[PDB]
Point group: D2
Chain length 282, copies 4
């Protein structure tokens, strides 16, 4: 098979808040537009399976693949129980791609497990893009744990490299999404006052503006070299393992295409958020 689309996308809970009646209604319409645009490009390019690097799925040991056959349930947020509760979803899985991913990524030396368990539910980083892109179940979905507490960014790079080798063996077109953040120093509890549209630290705002310029200028050797420090000093969501998996799949320091910005970087509860297409190398 073939990788046909790669993207970095936001999954902030304010996207669901934007759908609700209230003074926040429409506050994330541009972020939702970005998802729906990326979904349309996946339809245009005959994507049959989407792999999400989910920076909301926390793991301490190894890389985990949710390649469940079928995902059906009711989601309630443990962050915002009152507002995001009893949310229905139903999507088709791809156990076959999941097993190919396990086999090829395990050949790189990466510790990796594939799970086809009815009771292992999709995490939030995967449910959000699926809400806006896949309500008609046009796409199969496979999820990867990207909130990695005790892991090497070089192993997430290798996870992405092995993923390409899995796609080569799979009979279909695949899209990959890093579902997470730029900087993720969430706004302090004693500063709720300031609302959802500010950075906690000007520092994170400025580093995020520089990083977005690096993406637009295809400075990927330089970005890949500085990613450990960006992930540490800018409090990356899940340690920016989602960003590492995506760059791994694309060629790491050999990746050479300017990012196409879909949703310009915006603050959300003190964190940096963007939607961007990473064009494929020739």
């Amino acid at each position: 098979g073939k990788l046909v689309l790669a993207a970095k996308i936001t999954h902030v809970p304010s996207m669901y808040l934007s759908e609700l009646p209230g003074p926040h209604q429409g506050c994330r319409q541009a972020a939702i537009d970005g998802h729906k645009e990326i979904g349309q490009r996946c339809r245009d390019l005959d994507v049959d399976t989407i792999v999400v690097f989910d920076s909301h799925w926390l793991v301490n040991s190894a890389f985990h693949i949710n390649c469940g056959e079928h995902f059906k349930g009711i989601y309630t947020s443990n962050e915002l129980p009152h507002f995001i509760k009893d949310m229905e979803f139903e999507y088709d899985g791809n156990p076959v791609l999941g097993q190919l991913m396990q086999e090829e990524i395990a050949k790189t030396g990466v510790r990796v497990q594939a799970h086809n368990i009815k009771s292992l539910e999709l995490e939030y980083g995967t449910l959000v893009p699926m809400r806006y892109m896949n309500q008609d179940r046009r796409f199969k979905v496979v999820s990867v744990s990207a909130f990695c507490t005790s892991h090497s960014l070089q192993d997430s790079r290798k996870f992405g490299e092995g993923l390409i080798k899995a796609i080569e063996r799979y009979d279909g077109n695949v899209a990959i999404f890093a579902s997470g953040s730029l900087s993720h120093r969430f706004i302090w509890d004693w500063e709720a006052q300031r609302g959802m549209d500010t950075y906690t630290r000007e520092w994170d705002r400025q580093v995020d503006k520089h990083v977005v310029k690096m993406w637009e200028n295809a400075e990927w050797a330089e970005f890949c070299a500085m990613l450990p420090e960006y992930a540490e000093y800018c409090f990356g969501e899940g340690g920016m393992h989602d960003t590492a998996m995506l760059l791994g799949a694309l060629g790491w320091d050999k990746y050479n295409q300017p990012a196409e910005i879909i949703t310009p970087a915006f603050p959300s509860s003190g964190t940096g958020q963007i939607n961007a297409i990473f064009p494929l190398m020739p």
Copy 2:
């Protein structure tokens, strides 16, 4: 009503692994016996509700109370889903204690929300002690978010202080559990070969030994003063807000009782674990 028991307890997933057939069967027998002993004292002291400060429940904004009327479901770990899956549980809740907690804690100036929502499920740091102590539904349970990413430890202190005032207004006896860790520098993914019974860093091993000595010697003024640095430099599970909520309920720097070590400190996947009773001030 009355606070009658306070404890720091482990919830490591190796407790469930200890139950399973294999080379690790019985690897956490003494941790499980410590949970059972603490439960039995709860029975002896005519406890009707347990409040658990759950360091596995991640929140970014405010302190959240799960005071659902009824808890029933099937638990699958997203950390070790091959081993911890399809785990049945059913417990009774205490919405009345929950709303009192919200009333009294909000008067401290702390941001606090109480949830009585069917679909808001118990988190792992609450499920583990309920599994060993509460299978016969002797106790009502309330859960508090103690994985607090953007929160002051002085607000966790105030949460505990407000909780005492809520218990005073409640018609019955209450126990509180900080469900979490000492140091929580989880073992590196590339060091899986070392197994489950080691510390990641000798540094964490030695700081944890000093902290347990301080607890045993009632050095609570000194321990409270050093808690922000301990949480940072020894990678506390959820920032050690669970520890801060418990010490807040007990009197913070005026707490003067020697900790009773129910289960001696042990390493678990690189992290420090203990079961300890915190005797109440006369």
Copy 3:
């Protein structure tokens, strides 16, 4: 009196190495010519006294001013004593400007001491610019301790604010130099082979490029807001107190003039170096 010139300047030891016969002769010619250019503008503006914020002078308590009447001695580096040794110097001092500085800065509530002591010698961050600008003793010199181990950047801001008041009372024209670095993560001892013209970390290189862009675009409110994080995460030389003293004198977040880059940013032993004029507000 009048502040007539402000600058950020490099004092790297490779400037002296550039003068010596060997394979590195001329390796810092442009940095030296930047010093000479800034010196000539001081001559043109009728500067009688230069105040240097010396990021090589380490202090643990309070801000110290060397306002000695006369400076004469022989300098041997304790960093590169094989190459920088027996270096003769002689300059005139300004005890009157020093006492005005102590008077006005103490009114801000900052802890400040002024020293007029024969045996208190000029530090390296002052000797280097005086070597290239002041060999004919055209200028009196005063030095300020800007390697501040335990100090608030808001107090370095207040030091600069007070200095403007001292200059207003002084009968003459004054120039101020922040003598120090951008990033100062010095190259690791085991990486000696890579030589003198590289950054230790791509991270430092890229943050430094963003910071120079901010300076060129007069984004001073943003730069001032991010300075505490920059100094911490990019290992600022002396904590970037030199930069803070200079921006304090210039108006801090109200400073609105684009920096004039006299010598483009260059790596030196892993660290970021620049010569820049900070034009004065009308």
Copy 4:
């Protein structure tokens, strides 16, 4: 020749302040007593040369040995110029030991330079012990740069290992002093009011109390394993390279003798200070 004594010693400026008339007179008498006791033991053991690991001598590149033939001068503090100024000293050097040290330490792979330069003056970490121990010039002195900004603690270990091989080739008895601190989080500038006899952070006080117990219990494998973290999280004076050089010479994780406490650990301007003899292995 033979190593006959090893010690960790303080060099705090408050030792000189203790000698002066004022409310602080005698405030460091016990620290001075410790120096003079260690001096007397060096006389009793027929020491002819003292090597000091000087955590006040800052270097960015390589390890430097001050093995000048003769040291004579007047010292003025740039930390406290009013109180510590025009301090006379005169001591005999040992260029022969210095050259052996360079030869043997360079065989371990460590980058090391020996300097015999009249104008390269003794640093403060060396002048303080020499003031209290060597006013009659009974001992020759060699100084080593131990404020190492960019260096491996394993390289400081190898410097100590190589030093023993140098002493074996030298015709005399040698003593080694690590001249530095335990924790060195100097008291914040805005907390001057608290005086010189407090810790900045209870955290540093407690870690220092644990470390001193480890020394007294000969827990050297454990202490050596945690030293990188101690040096980082407790703000070690010069990064605790002085401590690593000493433990290097003594056997690192194979060292097995309980430290003899000469001056019990005491706070000085927020930092931890101790005088201790490290008995030689049989």
